[PDB]
Symmetry: C3
Subunit: 120 residues, 3 copies
Amino acid sequence: PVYMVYVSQDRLTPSAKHAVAKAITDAARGLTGTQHFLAQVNFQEQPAGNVFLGGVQQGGDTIFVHGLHREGRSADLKGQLAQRIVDDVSVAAEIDRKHIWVYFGEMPAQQMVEYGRFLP
Amino acid sequence: PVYMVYVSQDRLTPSAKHAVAKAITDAARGLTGTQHFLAQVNFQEQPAGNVFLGGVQQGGDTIFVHGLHREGRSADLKGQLAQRIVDDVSVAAEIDRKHIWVYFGEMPAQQMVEYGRFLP
Amino acid sequence: PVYMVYVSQDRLTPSAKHAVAKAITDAARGLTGTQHFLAQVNFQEQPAGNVFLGGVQQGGDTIFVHGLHREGRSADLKGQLAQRIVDDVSVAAEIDRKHIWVYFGEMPAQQMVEYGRFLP
């Protein structure tokens, strides 16, 4: 899987980025068994002020996680994984859970390529 | 919902970003009744020249809106909402509608978390 | 279609970006018939160090291609296109295939607008 993590520039220090990536990676392995080396966390930084909520410009605290998964997991597992990411990213980033959004999209494994190989 | 808005750096001034975010937020609530605070507009700026169309490098005028939605709306409502975003973003950014692309993706509410809470 | 191409800043020279964009555009048309002008390649650059794999911070070599397509192609064509993108991006960027990830998402044409008009 690939987790696109949308954050404001400099909101996360290198060690906070590492903590967040580890927290997402460990969530994605503890619950599903997805091996460590399969989890990509890709931080997309933008200047603070580029996020609007209800048309109101935000500071730099919002985090949006868009997880891109292969189809086939149960709704229970996906809901548990999403909640685990909220909780563990909240801790690793020192950010209130209310600032964290997490969406999971899914695709057939047959149209997903990782490390230049098709997914099982 | 989350609207990822892919624009060139400095193509939108702070007031143009606010107008675009308002136009997208107002389209969404005016057609589905999603509360204001539920609409995130997330601007992703890149240097001009990073967009290619048919392999031809573009200037800074392209706008691509990727809307990430809960499943369950009718094809008619989604089409109306996409068309409204084209029109109102065209006005708010004073940019030809031919430069505006809008795709909607959908996911089960059960794998979507906003403000650290699951969606209905 | 829109291909979002996530790369590290300055990993691709302007001529390498053009080559990658051409390679993706040519894959898309040569396999499906998608007309030249219909293919948008949108490069999203981030500082090297913003990609983590298995929690390990990466250099600037990863490439992730997120293709956004209209529904309706066969699984065979989609897999052929993804494999073709891996191969031709590998050459055009002179980058090991093992650094290239390619995911395809699909949506109904009825909720996709290109050049300010709805898709067939």
